[PDB]
Amino acid sequence: TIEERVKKIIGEQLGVKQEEVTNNASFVEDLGADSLDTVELVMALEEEFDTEIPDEEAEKITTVQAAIDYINGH
Amino acid sequence: TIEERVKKIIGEQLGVKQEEVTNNASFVEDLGADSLDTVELVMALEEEFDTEIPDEEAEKITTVQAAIDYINGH
Amino acid sequence: YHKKVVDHYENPRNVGSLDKTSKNVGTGLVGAPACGDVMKLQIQVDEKGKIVDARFKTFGCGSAIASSSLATEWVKGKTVEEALTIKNTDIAKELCLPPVKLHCSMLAEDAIKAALADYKLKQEP
Amino acid sequence: YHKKVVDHYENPRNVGSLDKTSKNVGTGLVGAPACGDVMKLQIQVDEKGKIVDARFKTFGCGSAIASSSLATEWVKGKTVEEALTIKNTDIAKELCLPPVKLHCSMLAEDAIKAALADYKLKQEP
Amino acid sequence: LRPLYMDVQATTPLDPRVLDAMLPYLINYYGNPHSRTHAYGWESEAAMERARQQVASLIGADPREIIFTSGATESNNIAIKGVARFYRSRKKHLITTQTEHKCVLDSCRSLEAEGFQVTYLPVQKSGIIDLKELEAAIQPDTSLVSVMTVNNEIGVKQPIAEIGRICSSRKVYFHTDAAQAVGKIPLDVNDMKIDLMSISGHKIYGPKGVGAIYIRRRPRVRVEALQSGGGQERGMRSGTVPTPLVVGLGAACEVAQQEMEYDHKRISKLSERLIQNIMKSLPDVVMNGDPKHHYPGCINLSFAYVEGESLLMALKDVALSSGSACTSASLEPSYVLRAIGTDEDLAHSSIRFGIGRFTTEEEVDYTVEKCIQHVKRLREMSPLWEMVQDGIDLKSIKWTQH
Amino acid sequence: LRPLYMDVQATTPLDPRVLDAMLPYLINYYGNPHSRTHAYGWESEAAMERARQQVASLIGADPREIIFTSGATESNNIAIKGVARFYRSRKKHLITTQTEHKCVLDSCRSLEAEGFQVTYLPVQKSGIIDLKELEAAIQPDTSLVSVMTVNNEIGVKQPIAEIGRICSSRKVYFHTDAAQAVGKIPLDVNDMKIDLMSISGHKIYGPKGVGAIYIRRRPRVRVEALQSGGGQERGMRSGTVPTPLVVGLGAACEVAQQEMEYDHKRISKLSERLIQNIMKSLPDVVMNGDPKHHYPGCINLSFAYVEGESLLMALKDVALSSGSACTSASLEPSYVLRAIGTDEDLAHSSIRFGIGRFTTEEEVDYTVEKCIQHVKRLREMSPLWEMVQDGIDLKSIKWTQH
Amino acid sequence: DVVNVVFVDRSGQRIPVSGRVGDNVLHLAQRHGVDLEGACEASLACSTCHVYVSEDHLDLLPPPEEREDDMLDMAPLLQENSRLGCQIVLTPELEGAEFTLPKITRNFYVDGHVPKPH
Amino acid sequence: SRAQVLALYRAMLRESKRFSAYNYRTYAVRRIRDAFRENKNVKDPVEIQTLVNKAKRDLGVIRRQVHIGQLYSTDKLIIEN
Amino acid sequence: SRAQVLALYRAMLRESKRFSAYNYRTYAVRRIRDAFRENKNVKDPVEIQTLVNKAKRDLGVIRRQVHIGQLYSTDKLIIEN
Ligand SMILES: *P(=O)(O)OCC(C)(C)[C@@H](O)C(=O)NCCC(=O)NCCSC(=O)CCCCCCCCCCC
Ligand SMILES: *P(=O)(O)OCC(C)(C)[C@@H](O)C(=O)NCCC(=O)NCCSC(=O)CCCCCCCCCCC
Ligand code: FES
Ligand SMILES: [Fe+2]
Ligand SMILES: [Fe+2]
């Protein structure tokens, strides 16, 4: 499952007890994360799902749904 | 002049008094040079005329005419 | 560390103890002079005069533990007279002990002699 | 090397010689005590008592050559009394000479004094 | 796979910043710094002076007070022997401690063979000297007092500032061996009243084969040089100064000055983690040295009824050190643990753990788990542990030696 | 643009093969070679022994006879002072030459300050000692004879094998300073009957801050250690052995053993070229030292009527060296040129050219051309040259000093 | 204004000297044929004017400056009563002062060479 | 400067994750994260500019050391398994 | 083996010409050209194989040192102008 692994890394990277990672929770407002944490979450996503997310696509990844959509599409 | 420069390096690389360099003189038989000298002559040609001669084309360069034809064509 | 010493250390033979009280068991507890190595070796001798079981417990370096383990299995199967012929040179030659570790083979031989002496001391009327 | 010393060594001023048999020319040839530096400074004095020309030739280190060149350019234009007031401290201060190179400024002053004394002796009845 | 490194007291890995600083002088700037006539020499000299200023800035000294050496062994030799020989005509007595490093102790012994008198001060159970004992031990003909800043084996910290105040009041030169302290705890030569100090490059993530000694200029301390030659390093250490090595030492000192507070916080956290996790799972484990005056990066623990070398052999995947006599090339028992009053069998049971700039929590946890398992196994093998379980006192045993 | 390097006698650039050999121990294998209990120490110890065998193979010795040091200065100090102090109870006399290096000479001077008698043998005008003079100078209480293999300033070669034969016949320990000879001319300790030998890493394209001393095992030579400590290096040099530096030294010795013949043939050709081209264009240029017993890589020329420092300043684009007192920090005249009988003004005019493994024919001819032009320019500036051109003898001048 | 001092040379010979107030010890020794090197001529660069001062007068000199102390670091056979002779000036308090020449200097003359007077 | 700081942080992390040696890799990652979080609330543009320049120098050092350590690489540690 | 030897010779020359330092570049070029011409008449295949293995090791050393010297490069010599 792709989105299961996406939620797992988001939970591991942000420390949200693997239960607040919904399909509409934002990284900055809902979850507790700043810009550096977002950078690291993007890099962790890149490491698990082997790829090279460009800057434009990385800036669009602000929610769990956005991350899931990018990983599934690519 | 392209072939003038080709003859100049051939003469410099082989030590032939800049007068033995002609359009049908071979590097091994007519001029005095071994395969190592031929390797170095090819590399010198590559340096002067900026290019990357492949192995197949380098093996075809046994005469001054062959060197001139390759340099002029490329 | 030589591979023989490493083998004996990581797979020691006959680690344990034997009931001190039993008539047919000798216990040898010895210590090294210029270091803290302490060896306890116990043997069991049957009615025929043959050593059927042996155990050890060693407080000491890896070479000491290897010497103790090697001395135990070497002791198993022999008689008292044969076991009295096990010198330290043989133990050290088998384990490839350097000069600084010769105290281990010396202490192992001392433990063997102490156990054998304890046994007949027990076998005296 | 300090840049002033380098400039004087790179572009020396008034290298050459003068007719030492002439009445109005004094020659000073001096040497350093603890090393091989040798200086020859010559000056030309006009009828008014003013120094109109100066030359030098130096066997020595770059600092010595710079000191001699600077001494020539400072000696041109002055009188004998004014030239008697140039000091090795001034030469060393201008060239920024480290302590080990103070022998150069000392030798340059000695050369100036020797040339002036030579001229005065030549101008004696 | 390679084992984990927890032996930072023995030596440290080279910091990548230090290597980056060194490489240009190993490739292009290879000139002799003592060549006075050309640009290779000039650039080498400039780099060497830059490194001197970096070291002086780290310890709060003037750059002219720093002399480069080949290591803290050479620095200790220079301090002790040079001071003692220079003031030989009036002063013939030296003071040091029983827990000093071997270079200091052997210099003092060879001076005793040279006619000097040496007092070896005892230490308390905590590993700290008694200021009353030092004050009573100072004689009118005392030349030098040598006390190390951080002990390399148990990590206790001596009261350097108090010792320096006492020495200054008594007009005695005070030397400290700071090889294990530089770049790890704050040091100020003027605040402490230090007259000489030894520094080692490879204890502070710098290169091996280089060191430095601090020698006070005001009021002037004199030493008699041990290495004869052309008069390099103000006449006190002849020979060619190894420009890449001294550049690396200077870069390491700058990095340490930048990183000390963060490093100390991290290491203190890691050290408490290691100590608490070991003690909460293993009975009969004691720390050697006093926690109140301890550098957390050097942890010396005794595992009762288990021999230290056997434990080390069991911990094949972790690089460590032990004070047991069976790890000595000459069966030397640990004189530091003897000096602090440790009983001999516990001294044979001591293990030294090192936590430095690059240690990870992952490594600490792995070491703790392996130690717990292997101490349990070796205690199941231990006759001393069996006898203790049976209530038979170990002191009362009549061991049959030979 | 950077100047050309022709100062190999002062120091050499690092060979890329040596750097390639060193780097793994500066990155990954950073353990202490004296750590007896883990794999980092074991691998460091193995690399050190490999390097020791490499050095011993280069000089024809058993590996057990090689002691690693911090350089040839330390090696010379160890040889001279250790031998003299160890045999102090019977032998009180030492022999060396007037042209030796400063470390050897200063060790002998400091020994003269602790009661020893030292004889400084004169040399002939060729720079070669007189064997009859040495044989007459040997006393029944003579301990040590020290003569360097290749002079660092004029490049003359002493008859080392003959000296060793004489010393063996007289039962006198023979030491040679081979810092400028190792890896450049053949050396065999047993054929030459050498008892002690000094080696320097950075003179043979190895790293700075490392060296070695050969000490003969059969019959045994003893020294008294100068550096007290833990007993490393068979008790003769305490301290941590710098594994990267000793690995580099071993690699450099192996490379020199493989490349010596080719290097000597090329260097000899280049040296002949430089000397002939200088002499065919400049009058009044003399070579210091005898060509018949000369190492071609060290060329010492005197340019009459031109001061050496001024010539060096004129050659701003070439790194060179001079014997002039004006290049000395204390105005020291050249004692080597004094010893071979060079008149002072010529000694003030001497230039040392170095030709090594990396010198090119391009560089040699550039140096020759610049030298010719600038010597002509400085002679046109020279009052001595003017006086000579006028027939006024320089010896007859009554110079007015002060 | 006459200061009477004594120079002790390497051989042990004692040389009485009748100096003056304001005199310089190096120049005063060289004027009287005492072989004190003094290469740099009181420029504080060579350290070869090194002398030993007698204990009864050492404390009567002005204390050395750190430039003098730095140059003394370079002098072989340094002692607690070591001074640079080129930095010492004669005062009436220095009556009877003795200056002993050290056996060697910073510059190497193991062949026995003696530099000409400066 | 926020975009420049984020880009520099990303570049530092990505290049530091390419360290061959475990100790250097873990240390560089931790240190960069701790330093950027430590200086999160700085206000003075001069101080921010200084920190940025220092970080560029550190990134250069990291690049060179990563490449050298890839040229000279050894086996992995026991805990990396 | 002739083609293999010629290819090895070409690779060694091509990479040695990329040395940043003048001394190393000139030395490596001259040394390779002298050694290959020196061993031009060897006949024992064992000796040829040994020489080829040595040359491969040397080529590896040259590659690493060229890259490191490009990472740490200085100005040119006065004669390269
Ligand atoms: P995000 O919500 O935008 O928040 C993050 C930032 C920093 C972008 C934001 O808070 C902000 O703009 N704050 C203003 C101050 C600022 O810019 N802070 C960061 C300054 S730059 C900095 O801290 C560099 C630190 C470099 C450390 C290098 C470590 C190298 C280690 C090498 C080991 C070998
Ligand atoms: P051409 O007519 O083909 O003739 C040339 C060859 C060599 C191809 C031909 O003569 C031949 O095959 N001869 C047989 C013997 C032979 O192969 N000789 C060469 C063997 S390989 C060799 O000599 C390798 C030398 C390596 C030198 C390394 C230099 C390293 C420098 C390092 C600087 C830091
Ligand atoms: S004369 Fe040179 S220091 Fe006194
Ligand atoms: Fe043991
Ligand atoms: Fe001069």
Numbering used by the authors:
A (entry chain G), B (entry chain C): 3 to 76
C (entry chain H), D (entry chain D): 35 to 159
E (entry chain E), F (entry chain A): 56 to 457
G (entry chain I): 69 to 186
H (entry chain F), I (entry chain B): 5 to 85
Quote the paper.
The process is initiated by the mitochondrial core ISC complex, which synthesizes a [2Fe-2S] cluster de novo from cysteine-derived sulfur and ferrous iron (Fe2+). This complex is composed of the iron-sulfur scaffold protein ISCU2, the dimeric pyridoxal phosphate (PLP)-dependent cysteine desulfurase subcomplex NFS1-ISD11-ACP1, the allosteric regulator frataxin (FXN), and the electron donor ferredoxin-2 (FDX2), which is itself reduced by the NADPH-dependent ferredoxin reductase (FDXR). The sulfane sulfur (S0) of the persulfide on ISCU2 is reduced to sulfide (S2-) by FDX2 to initiate [2Fe-2S] cluster formation. FDX2 and FXN compete for binding to overlapping sites at the core ISC complex during de novo [2Fe-2S] cluster biosynthesis.
